[PDB]
Design an enzyme around this catalytic site. Structure first.
Site, PDB file in Angstrom:
ATOM      1  N   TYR A 509       0.945  -1.143   0.134  1.00 43.37           N
ATOM      2  CA  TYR A 509      -0.140  -0.084   0.004  1.00 43.37           C
ATOM      3  C   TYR A 509       0.842   1.146  -0.026  1.00 43.37           C
ATOM      4  O   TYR A 509       1.189   1.967  -1.108  1.00 43.37           O
ATOM      5  CB  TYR A 509      -0.872   0.162   1.192  1.00 43.37           C
ATOM      6  CG  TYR A 509      -1.764   1.089   1.158  1.00 43.37           C
ATOM      7  CD1 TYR A 509      -1.955   2.138   2.058  1.00 43.37           C
ATOM      8  CD2 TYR A 509      -2.891   1.132   0.206  1.00 43.37           C
ATOM      9  CE1 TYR A 509      -2.449   3.367   1.927  1.00 43.37           C
ATOM     10  CE2 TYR A 509      -3.520   2.378  -0.031  1.00 43.37           C
ATOM     11  CZ  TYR A 509      -3.608   3.401   0.850  1.00 43.37           C
ATOM     12  OH  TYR A 509      -4.389   4.516   0.852  1.00 43.37           O
ATOM     13  N   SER A 592      -5.229   0.757  -5.076  1.00 44.91           N
ATOM     14  CA  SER A 592      -5.308   2.048  -4.684  1.00 44.91           C
ATOM     15  C   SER A 592      -3.621   2.549  -4.601  1.00 44.91           C
ATOM     16  O   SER A 592      -3.254   2.382  -5.673  1.00 44.91           O
ATOM     17  CB  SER A 592      -5.924   2.192  -3.436  1.00 44.91           C
ATOM     18  OG  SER A 592      -6.406   3.490  -3.228  1.00 44.91           O
ATOM     19  N   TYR A 593      -3.643   3.099  -3.553  1.00 38.36           N
ATOM     20  CA  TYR A 593      -2.015   3.878  -3.559  1.00 38.36           C
ATOM     21  C   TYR A 593      -1.179   2.650  -3.832  1.00 38.36           C
ATOM     22  O   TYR A 593      -0.209   2.740  -4.390  1.00 38.36           O
ATOM     23  CB  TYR A 593      -1.857   4.436  -2.120  1.00 38.36           C
ATOM     24  CG  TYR A 593      -0.574   5.292  -2.198  1.00 38.36           C
ATOM     25  CD1 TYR A 593       0.798   4.912  -2.182  1.00 38.36           C
ATOM     26  CD2 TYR A 593      -0.915   6.868  -2.114  1.00 38.36           C
ATOM     27  CE1 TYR A 593       1.822   5.735  -2.221  1.00 38.36           C
ATOM     28  CE2 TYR A 593       0.452   7.440  -2.041  1.00 38.36           C
ATOM     29  CZ  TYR A 593       1.615   6.921  -2.189  1.00 38.36           C
ATOM     30  OH  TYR A 593       2.768   7.802  -2.285  1.00 38.36           O
ATOM     31  N   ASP A 670     -15.429   3.737 -10.985  1.00 40.91           N
ATOM     32  CA  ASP A 670     -14.636   4.286  -9.785  1.00 40.91           C
ATOM     33  C   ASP A 670     -14.575   5.720  -9.956  1.00 40.91           C
ATOM     34  O   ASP A 670     -14.077   6.489 -10.737  1.00 40.91           O
ATOM     35  CB  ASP A 670     -13.282   3.844 -10.173  1.00 40.91           C
ATOM     36  CG  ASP A 670     -12.404   3.715  -8.760  1.00 40.91           C
ATOM     37  OD1 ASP A 670     -12.463   4.998  -7.947  1.00 40.91           O
ATOM     38  OD2 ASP A 670     -11.505   3.089  -8.641  1.00 40.91           O
ATOM     39  N   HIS A 702     -14.304   2.082  -6.587  1.00 38.12           N
ATOM     40  CA  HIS A 702     -12.989   1.911  -6.078  1.00 38.12           C
ATOM     41  C   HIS A 702     -12.919   0.649  -5.222  1.00 38.12           C
ATOM     42  O   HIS A 702     -11.835   0.014  -4.921  1.00 38.12           O
ATOM     43  CB  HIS A 702     -12.700   3.008  -5.241  1.00 38.12           C
ATOM     44  CG  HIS A 702     -10.922   3.174  -5.037  1.00 38.12           C
ATOM     45  ND1 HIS A 702     -10.204   3.048  -6.128  1.00 38.12           N
ATOM     46  CD2 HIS A 702     -10.373   3.512  -4.071  1.00 38.12           C
ATOM     47  CE1 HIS A 702      -8.867   2.956  -5.672  1.00 38.12           C
ATOM     48  NE2 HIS A 702      -9.024   3.329  -4.489  1.00 38.12           N
TER      49      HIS A 702
HETATM   50  C1  LIG Z   1      -6.784   6.680   6.067  1.00 39.31           C
HETATM   51  C2  LIG Z   1      -6.951   8.076   5.586  1.00 39.31           C
HETATM   52  C3  LIG Z   1      -7.451   8.723   7.016  1.00 39.31           C
HETATM   53  O1  LIG Z   1      -7.254   8.531   8.053  1.00 39.31           O
HETATM   54  N1  LIG Z   1      -8.153  10.158   6.930  1.00 39.31           N
HETATM   55  C4  LIG Z   1      -8.710  10.859   5.767  1.00 39.31           C
HETATM   56  C5  LIG Z   1      -9.151  10.233   4.731  1.00 39.31           C
HETATM   57  C6  LIG Z   1      -9.630   8.604   4.612  1.00 39.31           C
HETATM   58  N2  LIG Z   1      -8.185   8.392   4.443  1.00 39.31           N
HETATM   59  C7  LIG Z   1      -7.449   8.224   3.231  1.00 39.31           C
HETATM   60  O2  LIG Z   1      -6.432   7.928   3.196  1.00 39.31           O
HETATM   61  C8  LIG Z   1      -8.478   8.612   1.885  1.00 39.31           C
HETATM   62  C9  LIG Z   1      -7.777   8.625   0.683  1.00 39.31           C
HETATM   63  N3  LIG Z   1      -8.822   9.148  -0.234  1.00 39.31           N
HETATM   64  C10 LIG Z   1      -7.552   7.089   0.448  1.00 39.31           C
HETATM   65  C11 LIG Z   1      -7.190   6.969  -0.896  1.00 39.31           C
HETATM   66  C12 LIG Z   1      -5.778   7.425  -1.260  1.00 39.31           C
HETATM   67  C13 LIG Z   1      -5.304   6.894  -2.647  1.00 39.31           C
HETATM   68  F1  LIG Z   1      -3.843   7.454  -2.921  1.00 39.31           F
HETATM   69  C14 LIG Z   1      -5.920   6.455  -3.626  1.00 39.31           C
HETATM   70  F2  LIG Z   1      -5.456   6.278  -4.787  1.00 39.31           F
HETATM   71  C15 LIG Z   1      -7.298   6.162  -3.492  1.00 39.31           C
HETATM   72  C16 LIG Z   1      -8.147   6.431  -2.219  1.00 39.31           C
HETATM   73  F3  LIG Z   1      -9.037   6.095  -2.082  1.00 39.31           F
END
Ligand SMILES: C[C@@H]1C(=O)NCCCN1C(=O)C[C@H](N)Cc1cc(F)c(F)cc1F
Ligand SMILES: *[C@@H]1O[C@H](CO)[C@@H](O[C@@H]2O[C@H](CO)[C@@H](O)[C@H](O)[C@H]2NC(C)=O)[C@H](O)[C@H]1NC(C)=O
Ligand SMILES: *[C@@H]1O[C@H](CO)[C@@H](O[C@@H]2O[C@H](CO)[C@@H](O)[C@H](O)[C@H]2NC(C)=O)[C@H](O)[C@H]1NC(C)=O
Ligand SMILES: *[C@@H]1O[C@H](CO)[C@@H](O[C@@H]2O[C@H](CO)[C@@H](O)[C@H](O)[C@H]2NC(C)=O)[C@H](O)[C@H]1NC(C)=O
Ligand SMILES: *[C@@H]1O[C@H](CO)[C@@H](O[C@@H]2O[C@H](CO)[C@@H](O)[C@H](O)[C@H]2NC(C)=O)[C@H](O)[C@H]1NC(C)=O
Ligand SMILES: *[C@@H]1O[C@H](CO)[C@@H](O[C@@H]2O[C@H](CO)[C@@H](O)[C@H](O)[C@H]2NC(C)=O)[C@H](O)[C@H]1NC(C)=O
Ligand SMILES: *[C@@H]1O[C@H](CO)[C@@H](O[C@@H]2O[C@H](CO)[C@@H](O)[C@H](O)[C@H]2NC(C)=O)[C@H](O)[C@H]1NC(C)=O
Ligand SMILES: *[C@@H]1O[C@H](CO)[C@@H](O[C@H]2O[C@H](CO)[C@@H](O)[C@H](O)[C@H]2NC(C)=O)[C@H](O)[C@H]1NC(C)=O
Ligand SMILES: *[C@@H]1O[C@H](CO)[C@@H](O[C@H]2O[C@H](CO)[C@@H](O)[C@H](O)[C@H]2NC(C)=O)[C@H](O)[C@H]1NC(C)=O
Ligand SMILES: *[C@H]1O[C@H](CO)[C@@H](O[C@@H]2O[C@H](CO)[C@@H](O)[C@H](O)[C@H]2NC(C)=O)[C@H](O)[C@H]1NC(C)=O
Ligand SMILES: C[C@@H]1C(=O)NCCCN1C(=O)C[C@H](N)Cc1cc(F)c(F)cc1F
Ligand SMILES: *[C@@H]1O[C@H](CO)[C@@H](O)[C@H](O)[C@H]1NC(C)=O
Ligand SMILES: *[C@@H]1O[C@H](CO)[C@@H](O)[C@H](O)[C@H]1NC(C)=O
Ligand SMILES: *[C@@H]1O[C@H](CO)[C@@H](O)[C@H](O)[C@H]1NC(C)=O
Ligand SMILES: *[C@@H]1O[C@H](CO)[C@@H](O)[C@H](O)[C@H]1NC(C)=O
Ligand SMILES: *[C@@H]1O[C@H](CO)[C@@H](O)[C@H](O)[C@H]1NC(C)=O
Lengths: 728, 728
Positions: A509, A592-593, A670, A702
């Site tokens: 990840y 995803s990431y 997505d 997604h």
């Molecule tokens: C876990 C993290 C959190 O704790 N708080 C704020 C939002 C929820 N959180 C996130 O990382 C959301 C991001 N959009 C997730 C994420 C990162 C990424 F690089 C993608 F390509 C797609 C995706 F869905």
């Protein structure tokens, strides 16, 4: 003898994991659903009663998706006609059932297609959002008072978040906050008028002749962001005035000078609210503390009460500035912030003093503050045994900071190293949730003496089943790189023999502040791969990962697609040098990431991996949303970070994919990582003559979580992996 | 020892077929482009002169896409800035060069982004369409006259076709028709106001942050169709002070009663125009013959000159009512129509007489009328040796229909059995183009005594190169099914040995009135599969196939996805019984209609096929366009043929795919067979838990023809087929 954990086991969930989800309705009672009916439990003695029999709603004519009891126990909100939207958002129908006179309210009912509904924190007032406007009902059977008239689909959002705020900031669809006793209703308003739209086709059932085009206001990196405003309305005056005034609380001057975001709303007392704002360049945030002025009916935020939080090494907060926890009188609060060493710890603030006092410290971090009483503050941290991947509940004495008791560490050290907690209304009791390394264990405890009251769920049933299967083992440890230690975990096949060379799959990840090496117990795809296919599945937390201090977390600042990618490749080299890995059979995969990192790794030309699978990957940062992307990358302009934006794309490494077997997968619907991202990867590969495998999932998002697609994608991925490792 | 014809040879075109594309400019001379220079040839002696220097435009500044010399030889239209639209449409910029004064016209030039342009049939007048409106230029350097003012993008089309009329009716973007001497300009007007739009994403270059949504008026089966009107304008009486007057010719009442189409426009004389109309239920068409009234200035179409053409067994014409070939005075005409036996033959019509006389007859068909003089009518048919897959040129004495002479049959029977022809202005000379079974051969002939003047191009160079490669052979033969003979062809590997077992790939199209078994020589994917991989590639013409009479062609009327699918399975079943076929390795593949049939076959549960590949297939008829679909299926309404529409989908057979290996491929920008069609197939397969292979091509349309995508798709399919057949 003894079967193994097979793909079907995973896809059919034959080995079910039990949990114990309770809902505190007071300081010593909680609700529990035991086979379609709601039971009420007395925490103290463990005795219970039927709160609502499963036959209460048979002739309701609908399937109740969920329920919600008003704070005063007088009414129950029934949710049905649930229609999922994004990650947290959805719409539904609702009916209110009077629990006293056992009747379903049929007058002045909540509209169909309601976007959000919440009881007041006290009593039974209701606030809901419909057609993007806020409404309040003082009584379940009386008419609603409309609060806003500007609501407009895809344009003005009152009381609910737009796409990017829902996903990246509040992790919720709701954007309204009742004051503690319910007098005031505070809310945010998002204006997406100039926000560009992402458009993609949705095919629907076969009967739809023409595909539908889904359009959603979505700000990609560097694009026009939604603007926001904040208001508070006195709900107690609704029945006295024809049109109650929503008093606006403007952002401070330091934010108004440029693009900004509202990133936190936290009430302190009945007449004091705190708000945190964050600049579009996410390394500067300001918290205002505003008081109601009974003579003007307005809200004022004294600059002597304003608190600044900024970062010189990265962005502020893990994903956003942290929320404050105020003392009862609202005159002070605790908040997790990064100390001078770069480790997140609890700092004690006086509302009108700019310098705070840290109450915890060390080379470890506080994950979150869970409860605060007049005498103690309870928090979760990874201090125990210096394991960043472990989590424990602690109690600190507000009158003597040197008095810190770990409440969960020694409960069952071998079976439990990853805890979560749930306190009763006044923290009189707490439920501990152990999720690893052993089978999940749920327990109830008394706060007055910290004694265990009883085991709620120990998963004995599952333990019994798993004894008849060759389960894989898990190893959690670290390797030292450049004087710093970096953790990793390995899912090892049964009867592992280090004198052998096993094929290895790196599960990645690696996004900022993520952690893939922990003590949590999981039954997933890697379980089957290690158990049945004798494959070692590894994960590594390198630069950019969280819960280990800013030195590690902020190492990728303004540089995504570099260190976290390289450290993954280096981790694989380290694993091969461990002697039990077959260097000819090392694969990598992520979602995803993780799909991005996987793709970046596969296109690096390292020669280390034979094959990889990217699911719904980001391919170039200018395609991802503003809030998340810019937090780490800044703006894609020549005066800022455009050069790195352009240098960190998957497409620019297309030629190197000639050296590997690649499987690319993406859901066509997505809304988060647009199919566009994989469309550009495939085009780049086609353009340089690279062959690869691909799979699209019609109308999946997604999560590719629909039951059929979930089974289909993991089945497809298993064949690809087995083929790459030629098992078969 | 001697290489084989490889995949790279196919993809890089190492072995190129030479052609000889000439342009007749009179009854005795033609233009031929040699060494980039345009030469004019005297047909009688073969002597030539340079017509225009390949350097005349050395510093033109633009890359000339094509040229068009005016009928009188006085000017040359230069085409550049070519931008492709659909199958026939495109826009471009144009310049007119004066050949006499060797000067490029710089005043009053044709607009940029012009949609269509054409010289008048005689002299040098021009007519072009820009922004959906018609314009006329009497002289290359004078200002043009605006003929229409209602032009509106995606709504009103003047002188150009909309998507469906372009693809399915006229096979051209052009919707204008000059009278013989250029006096009158006839044009159609299309109104797509209520035609629904198909919408899909276009990703474009990596630099485009947000994908664009393409939308085009496209009537799917049963949807609202575009409406049409027909106009005629006198170009000899245009005024720069008054707006030109267009005279409308309305369709007959038998057409105005319901939805209909304009399907053919053919001028008879300088003052007589014929038009054919077709009902939306395509088994009834009407031809009107209209004469210009010099005193009225109107066009009148006497009912006594109306000719009805209908069908009781299917639709009218092969793909539409055939075009009439009028005599010099325009009082009578020849037209191919299905006779009482169901075989297409030439009928001789008197304009004011209802009964026509057939001048040819027999169990074979006339393919097309090619030239007409007062003494003879020249046509191409598949009469020779009773081979429906062969084509030869014949002439018939108009004064004695028993005097029919084949003009190409015996020229070179071993090398040539498939001809097409090109006559000079007054049919004084004709060029014969032999395209199989041997290498293409182009020859010139004089009509007076049918002398074979000389060989224009014999591809002897290619023949020399091919002698050093192990080329496959082609077997053309037939199998009998219920006392009826159906033809097939087999591309056989070099050194074919009937004592060995060869894997077999069935190459299928099988759309109504198609033919895949013929004597044409081709260098394609099948050539490589046979030559290098030793795979037999067969094709079969079953029920629904053309050129063999309506009994066979109309067998699938109102029932697509039935007999044509069953017949391919039957053929494969028979081939599998032959000694040289490995019944364990039989595959099937097709593109377009062939993708549909391939999918329908693989989901039939027949058990005959191990694997198959469908490229851009139709999956349910309601998704395809109205004009083509309804022609064969009627309307998708319960009162018409909805049941069969619903019973002939690929999706309903999903379950039966569990026994075969399937590769599904589709371009995301397919404006013809929408990606939607494959998106529904994949969703159905996922829903029943069947694994399969897929590949989307970003931004490619129905042809998946861009150079890189073309190489990538055939490389990917080759890997799939070889793996399926266990071939190294
Ligand atoms: C876990 C993290 C959190 O704790 N708080 C704020 C939002 C929820 N959180 C996130 O990382 C959301 C991001 N959009 C997730 C994420 C990162 C990424 F690089 C993608 F390509 C797609 C995706 F869905
Ligand atoms: C759990 O059991 C206790 C013990 O019987 C119940 O306690 C009530 O306590 C009050 C005050 O102490 C007594 O006056 C009541 O008589 C008790 N209840 C009854 C029914 O007699 C308690 O109600 C039970 N709680 C639940 C959720 O079942
Ligand atoms: C949302 O923001 C838009 C601007 O993006 C506001 O629209 C402007 O409104 C003013 C005054 O009403 C007009 O003069 C402008 O022409 C508008 N600009 C645009 C781009 O439309 C809009 O008023 C805001 N809505 C709310 C409820 O605050
Ligand atoms: C309640 O008060 C709000 C705010 O004064 C009213 O909203 C205004 O409505 C007028 C037109 O009716 C607009 O010109 C303003 O731009 C609106 N302002 C805002 C902040 O929305 C609302 O109309 C009132 N409702 C009733 C029933 O009177
Ligand atoms: C909730 O808190 C609000 C705000 O403090 C209370 O409302 C105030 O009550 C005092 C009386 O103690 C009045 O003098 C003020 O005029 C009120 N202010 C406002 C803005 O309403 C309210 O009484 C509390 N609710 C409950 C149930 O205690
Ligand atoms: C093309 O044909 C048209 C129509 O037959 C010719 O136009 C006629 O010409 C005569 C003169 O010889 C006039 O008296 C008529 O009034 C014209 N009719 C119309 C409708 O214009 C025209 O001359 C021919 N053009 C060429 C180049 O031969
Ligand atoms: C042209 O085809 C249509 C449709 O097959 C024929 O019209 C009728 O179609 C309905 C079903 O859609 C049947 O119930 C009728 O029996 C068909 N015939 C008639 C007369 O209504 C139509 O007959 C065909 N026309 C010709 C000349 O063959
Ligand atoms: C082909 O050859 C003929 C001669 O055989 C050329 O000459 C004829 O045509 C010329 C005009 O095109 C005239 O100027 C000559 O008088 C005429 N000669 C005869 C005997 O008829 C003819 O031009 C040549 N054509 C080409 C295209 O080069
Ligand atoms: C093109 O077709 C449209 C629709 O068939 C014509 O407009 C008609 O239909 C409208 C609804 O789409 C009605 O509201 C109008 O009353 C009706 N007539 C007019 C004049 O709009 C439209 O005129 C056609 N355009 C042309 C150039 O023929
Ligand atoms: C059509 O567009 C072209 C392209 O703009 C015009 O050509 C000129 O091209 C030169 C460079 O080659 C530019 O500097 C000019 O500005 C362009 N326009 C003009 C007016 O000079 C062309 O003129 C246009 N022609 C028509 C008929 O629309
Ligand atoms: C060959 C045939 C012809 O001769 N005349 C009229 C139009 C050109 N012709 C056609 O068949 C056009 C059709 N759209 C071709 C066709 C058929 C089909 F089933 C598809 F899924 C896609 C496609 F492109
Ligand atoms: C509750 O409902 C379930 C159905 O889900 C039924 O099996 C069970 O017996 C009911 N129990 C009680 C106590 O009503
Ligand atoms: C919700 O919709 C249903 C069906 O459309 C209708 O019968 C019901 O009255 C609606 N309820 C409300 C509150 O609008
Ligand atoms: C915030 O980030 C910008 C961009 O890197 C930087 O120029 C500025 O100095 C930063 N502010 C602080 C306090 O670090
Ligand atoms: C020609 O018709 C158009 C379309 O209505 C009109 O706008 C234009 O002014 C007319 N010109 C003349 C000269 O009549
Ligand atoms: C004749 O053969 C056809 C296919 O060629 C078949 O469908 C039909 O049932 C057979 N019998 C008759 C009487 O047509």
């Amino acid at each position: 003898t003894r079967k193994t954990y097979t793909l079907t086991d995973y896809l059919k969930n034959t080995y079910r994991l039990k949990l114990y989800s309770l809902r505190w309705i007071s300081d010593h009672e909680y609700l529990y659903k035991q086979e379609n009916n709601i039971l009420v439990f007395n925490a103290e003695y463990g005795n219970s009663s039927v709160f609502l029999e499963n036959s209460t709603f048979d002739e309701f004519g609908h399937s109740i998706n969920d329920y919600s009891i008003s704070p005063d126990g007088q009414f129950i909100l029934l949710e049905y006609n649930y229609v999922k939207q994004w990650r947290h958002s959805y719409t539904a129908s609702y009916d209110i059932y009077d629990l006293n006179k056992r009747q379903l309210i049929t007058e002045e009912r909540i509209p169909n297609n309601t976007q959000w509904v919440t009881w007041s924190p006290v009593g039974h007032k209701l606030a809901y959002v419909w057609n993007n406007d806020i409404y309040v009902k003082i009584e379940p059977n009386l008419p609603s008072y409309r609060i806003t008239w500007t609501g407009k689909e895809d344009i003005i959002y009152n009381g609910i978040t737009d796409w990017v705020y829902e996903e990246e900031v509040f992790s919720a669809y709701s954007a309204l906050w009742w004051s503690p006793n319910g007098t005031f209703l505070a809310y945010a308003q998002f204006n997406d008028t100039e926000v560009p739209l992402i458009e993609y086709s949705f095919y629907s059932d076969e009967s739809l002749q023409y595909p539908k085009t889904v359009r959603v206001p979505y700000p990609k990196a560097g694009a026009v962001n939604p603007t926001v405003k904040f208001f508070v309305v006195n709900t107690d005056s609704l029945s006295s005035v024809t049109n109650a005034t929503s008093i606006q609380i403007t952002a401070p001057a330091s934010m108004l000078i440029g693009d900004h975001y509202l990133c936190d709303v936290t009430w302190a007392t009945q007449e004091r609210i705190s708000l945190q704002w964050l600049r579009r360049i996410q390394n500067y945030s300001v918290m205002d503390i505003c008081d109601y002025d009974e003579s003007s009916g307005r809200w004022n935020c004294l600059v002597a009460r304003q608190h600044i939080e900024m970062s010189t090494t990265g962005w502020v907060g893990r994903f956003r500035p942290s929320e404050p926890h105020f003392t009862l009188d609202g005159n002070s609060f605790y908040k997790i912030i990064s100390n001078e060493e770069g480790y997140r710890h609890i700092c004690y603030f006086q509302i009108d003093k700019k310098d705070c006092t840290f109450i915890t410290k060390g080379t470890w971090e506080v994950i979150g503050i869970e409860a605060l009483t007049s005498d103690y503050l309870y928090y979760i941290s990874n201090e125990y045994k210096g394991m960043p991947g472990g989590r424990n509940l602690y109690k600190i004495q507000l009158s003597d900071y040197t008095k810190v008791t770990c409440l969960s560490c020694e409960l069952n050290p071998e079976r439990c190293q990853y805890y979560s907690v749930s306190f009763s209304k006044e923290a009189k009791y707490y439920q501990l949730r152990c999720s690893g390394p052993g089978l999940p264990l749920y327990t109830l405890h008394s706060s007055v003496n910290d004694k265990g009251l009883r085991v709620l769920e120990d998963n004995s049933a599952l333990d019994k089943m798993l004894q008849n299967v060759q389960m894989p083992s898990k190893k959690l440890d670290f390797i030292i790189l450049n004087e710093t230690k970096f953790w990793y975990q390995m899912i090892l096949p049964p009867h592992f023999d280090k004198s052998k060379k096993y094929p290895l799959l790196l599960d990645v990840y690696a996004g900022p502040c993520s952690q893939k090496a922990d003590t949590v117990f999981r039954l997933n795809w890697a379980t089957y791969l290690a158990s049945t296919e004798n494959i070692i599945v590894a994960s590594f937390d390198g630069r950019g990962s969280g819960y280990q201090g800013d030195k590690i977390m902020h190492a990728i600042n303004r540089r995504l697609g570099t260190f976290e990618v390289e450290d993954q490749i280096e981790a694989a080299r380290q694993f091969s040098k461990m002697g039990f890995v077959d260097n000819k059979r090392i694969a990598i995969w992520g979602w995803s990431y993780g799909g991005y990192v996987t793709s970046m790794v596969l296109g690096s030309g390292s020669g280390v991996f034979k094959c990889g699978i990217a699911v719904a990957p980001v391919s170039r940062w200018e395609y991802y949303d503003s809030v998340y992307t810019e937090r780490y990358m800044g703006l894609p302009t020549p005066e800022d970070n455009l050069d790195h934006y352009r240098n960190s794309t998957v497409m620019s490494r297309a030629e190197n994919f000639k050296q590997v077997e690649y499987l690319l997968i993406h859901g066509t619907a997505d809304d988060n990582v647009h199919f566009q991202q994989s469309a550009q990867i495939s085009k780049a590969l086609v353009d340089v003559g690279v062959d690869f495998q691909a799979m699209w999932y019609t109308d999946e998002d997604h999560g590719i979580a629909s039951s059929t697609a979930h089974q289909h994608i993991y089945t497809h991925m298993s064949h690809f992996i087995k083929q790459c490792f030629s098992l078969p």
